[PDB]
Amino acid sequence: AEKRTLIAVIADEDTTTGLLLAGIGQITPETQEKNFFVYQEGKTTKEEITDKFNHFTEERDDIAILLINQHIAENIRARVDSFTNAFPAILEIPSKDHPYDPEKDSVLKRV
Amino acid sequence: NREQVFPTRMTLGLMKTKLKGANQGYSLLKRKSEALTKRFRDITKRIDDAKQKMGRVMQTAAFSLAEVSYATGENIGYQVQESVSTARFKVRARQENVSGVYLSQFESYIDPEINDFRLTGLGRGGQQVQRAKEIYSRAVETLVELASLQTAFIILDEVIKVTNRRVNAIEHVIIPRTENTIAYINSELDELDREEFYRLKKVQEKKQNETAKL
Amino acid sequence: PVTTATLGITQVFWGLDKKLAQRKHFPSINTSVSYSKYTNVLNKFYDSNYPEFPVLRDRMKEILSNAEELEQVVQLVGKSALSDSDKITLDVATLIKEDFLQQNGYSTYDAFCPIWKTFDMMRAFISYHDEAQKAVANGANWSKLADSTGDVKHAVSSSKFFEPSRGEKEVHGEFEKLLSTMQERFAE
Amino acid sequence: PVTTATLGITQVFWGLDKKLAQRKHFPSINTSVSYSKYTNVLNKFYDSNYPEFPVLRDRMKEILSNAEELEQVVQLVGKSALSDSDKITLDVATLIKEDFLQQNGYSTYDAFCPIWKTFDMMRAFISYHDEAQKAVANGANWSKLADSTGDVKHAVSSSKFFEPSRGEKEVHGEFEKLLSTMQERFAESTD
Numbered sequence: 090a091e092k093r094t095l096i097a098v099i100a101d102e103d104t105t106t107g108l109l110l111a112g113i114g115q116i117t118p119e120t121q122e123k124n125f126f127v128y129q130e131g132k133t134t135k136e137e138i139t140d141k142f143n144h145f146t147e148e149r150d151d152i153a154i155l156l157i158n159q160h161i162a163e164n165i166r167a168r169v170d171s172f173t174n175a176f177p178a179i180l181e182i183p184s185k186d187h188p189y190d191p192e193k194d195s196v197l198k199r200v
Numbered sequence: 201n202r203e204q205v206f207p208t209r210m211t212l213g214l215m216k217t218k219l220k221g222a223n224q225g226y227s228l229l230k231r232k233s234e235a236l237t238k239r240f241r242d243i244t245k246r247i248d249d250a251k252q253k254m255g256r257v258m259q260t261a262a263f264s265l266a267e268v269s270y271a272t273g274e275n276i277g278y279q280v281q282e283s284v285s286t287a288r289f290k291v292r293a294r295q296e297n298v299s300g301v302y303l304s305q306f307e308s309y310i311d312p313e314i315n316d317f318r319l320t321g322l323g324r325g326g327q328q329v330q331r332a333k334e335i336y337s338r339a340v341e342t343l344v345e346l347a348s349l350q351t352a353f354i355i356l357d358e359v360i361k362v363t364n365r366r367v368n369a370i371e372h373v374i375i376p377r378t379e380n381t382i383a384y385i386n387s388e389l390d391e392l393d394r395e396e397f398y399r400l401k402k403v404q405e406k407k408q409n410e411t412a413k414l
Numbered sequence: 415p416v417t418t419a420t421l422g423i424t425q426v427f428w429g430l431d432k433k434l435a436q437r438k439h440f441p442s443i444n445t446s447v448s449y450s451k452y453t454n455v456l457n458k459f460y461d462s463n464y465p466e467f468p469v470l471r472d473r474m475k476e477i478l479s480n481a482e483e484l485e486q487v488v489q490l491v492g493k494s495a496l497s498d499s500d501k502i503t504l505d506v507a508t509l510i511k512e513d514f515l516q517q518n519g520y521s522t523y524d525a526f527c528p529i530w531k532t533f534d535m536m537r538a539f540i541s542y543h544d545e546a547q548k549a550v551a552n553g554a555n556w557s558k559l560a561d562s563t564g565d566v567k568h569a570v571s572s573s574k575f576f577e578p579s580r581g582e583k584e585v586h587g588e589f590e591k592l593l594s595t596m597q598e599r600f601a602e
Numbered sequence: 603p604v605t606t607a608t609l610g611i612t613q614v615f616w617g618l619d620k621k622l623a624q625r626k627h628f629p630s631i632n633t634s635v636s637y638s639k640y641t642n643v644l645n646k647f648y649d650s651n652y653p654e655f656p657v658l659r660d661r662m663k664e665i666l667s668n669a670e671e672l673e674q675v676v677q678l679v680g681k682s683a684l685s686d687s688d689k690i691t692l693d694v695a696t697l698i699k700e701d702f703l704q705q706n707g708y709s710t711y712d713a714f715c716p717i718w719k720t721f722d723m724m725r726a727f728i729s730y731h732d733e734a735q736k737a738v739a740n741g742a743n744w745s746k747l748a749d750s751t752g753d754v755k756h757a758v759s760s761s762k763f764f765e766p767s768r769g770e771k772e773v774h775g776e777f778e779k780l781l782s783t784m785q786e787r788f789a790e791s792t793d
């Protein structure tokens with residue numbers, strides 16, 4: 090929708106820093122919410138990552154494209170599979186030192 | 201295995217019109233499914249190509265970010281997160297009408313209100329930071345393109361599934377049900393015609409007997 | 415059988431449309447099945463009095479038939495994708511079936527629509543359709559054009575509301591001004 | 603003509619469907635076309651003996667009609683569009699058709715289902731529908747609820763095997779125990 094104008098980033102620290110340098114993600118002052126939240130495997134937990142992804146997909150209506158790390162998506166594979174709705178889109182970008190896995194991609198799995 | 205239609209000549213004509221319309225719709229929808237499936241094959245090929253492009257672009261963007269961090273001597277992630285008041289990059293959905301569908305395609309945009317990056321206060325490596333920012337902006341544009349393509353893929357697949365389901369539903373329910381209703385109505389009309397014929401034959405026999413008596 | 419024989423031996427036949435009657439659209443005359451074999455012989459009177467009447471009624475018949483086929487396709491395939499020309503065809507046909515064809519017999523204005531008034535209304539509707547088609551062929555977006563020309567569409571709809579008792583001289587002057595400003599309104 | 607005249611004169615229509623005659627779904631009473639105009643006069647007997655009989659019967663008719671509409675919808679456009687409550691309606695109506703309505707007249711248990719046993723079975727099936735509806739409205743997923751309450755569903759479907767020869771007192775106690783255990787199981791699944 091036209092309301093969804095943002096690029097959510099839930100990838101690793103390096104990928105989150107790169108996205109922030111690009112300017113895709115930001116923290117809304119009035120809403121006290123960050124479009125791009127830095128999260129790693131050690132940081133927070135799998136349940137916290139899944140909750141953040143669900144909030145970005147549904148609660149964060151402004152989010153249009155979601156960028157999640159492949160390592161992060163591995164622990165959130167169930168959430169990725171459950172996110173069958175086209176909007177917001179999900180991109181299976183991988184983190185540092187981890188090659189992208191076509192099999193692990195949820196969108197490519199439908200093929 | 202039929203429709204509860206009252207056998208009548210008008211109802212027979214209505215059911216023939218329904219059968220003709222259902223056949224036309226079945227042919228039209230099968231052809232539309234074929235065209236949409238061709239578009240879908242093109243879409244999935246572009247998805248594979250964009251996935252490879254995403255892999256190479258993310259590799260080079262990670263390399264550039266690592267080089268910028270090494271040049272600066274510290275992780276700029278904290279500074280970038282601090283300077284996240286507003287987003288200079290935005291995506292606007294565009295209702296691109298490919299074939300008959302109206303799949304939404306994202307269109308990237310750049311907001312100059314907060315276009316300033318975190319180069320200031322980084323300590324050193326300003327040129328490296330700017331190069332990394334440009335590489336990340338190119339990666340973000342590629343990400344917007346890939347997300348638009350994936351959303352189009354999902355919408356197109358859903359529409360194709362619905363259209364194929366409706367084609368099968370027509371061909372296996374609506375056409376057979378309407379054909380069975382046509383056959384039953386024709387049989388009942390023939391039965392009424394036969395009953396009228398027998399009644400007229402009885403009347404003719406009575407008239408002939410009266411003529412013979414007279 | 416009585417209807418079959420009457421159609422076989424008649425020259426004009428104004429057929430009933432069950433769909434139009436169930437919509438309380440009056441008069442409920444089915445355009446597809448109805449006919450009149452007096453068009454050819456009446457071409458003389460039309461050329462003598464209202465020269466553009468036959469071509470206008472043929473244009474409206476073509477519009478109605480094209481939009482009937484397009485509406486069948488719409489009811490079949492959802493009408494998600496339609497050309498600008500096809501959208502104009504359906505919109506113009508709906509406008510015709512709501513303003514021109516439909517009339518209230520008990521209403522004061524539309525109790526008896528004279529022949530000159532009917533000719534003027536055909537002029538208005540056909541000119542609207544032709545100008546919209548020309549604009550769409552130029553490259554204008556149909557949605558924006560309709561948003562801008564809702565006033566002109568309302569004017570050509572109120573052409574039905576135009577009173578016939580004002581006389582042929584005054585009413586035709588009003589229809590002359592109606593499509594005069596209609597041409598200029600499509601420049602934007 | 604004989605059927606039309608008979609329906610014009612009679613008051614009860616126990617129409618039979620051959621699609622149900624096949625696949626051994628006797629009695630094959632076509633619940634849609636079938637009617638009975640004696641329900642209004644039997645309301646007095648129901649109030650006298652089994653007060654909840656008319657309301658349970660009306661609930662069963664509503665469930666069957668709604669699930670017939672949903673069955674047309676699912677046969678047309680699949681089961682993905684149907685809501686949760688639609689899924690419960692379809693499942694409970696299939697249960698009713700398979701267990702309650704389908705009565706084998708040549709088995710020992712279902713050769714003669716008396717009025718009290720029929721009332722108890724309607725109470726059990728309608729209570730199962732109501733409990734599933736309430737649990738789903740509370741937010742429980744229907745698939746998980748069905749997986750957890752398959753035992754309760756099988757107990758409800760197996761209530762047709764209760765011998766009427768055991769007497770009204772003994773079987774009605776069995777039905778009361780079935781309803782109590784059903785309520786406990788649904789509460790546990792919801793919790």
Ligand SMILES: Nc1ncnc2c1ncn2[C@@H]1O[C@H](COP(=O)(O)OP(=O)(O)O)[C@@H](O)[C@H]1O
Nearest residue numbers: 623626627628629630704705706707708709713
């Ligand atoms: N309530 C029932 N329980 C078990 N079987 C039944 C029942 N009703 C009918 N049938 C079966 O249907 C078969 C056909 O008998 P039926 O249909 O009653 O004769 P008719 O064709 O005269 O109606 C029988 O063999 C019987 O086994």
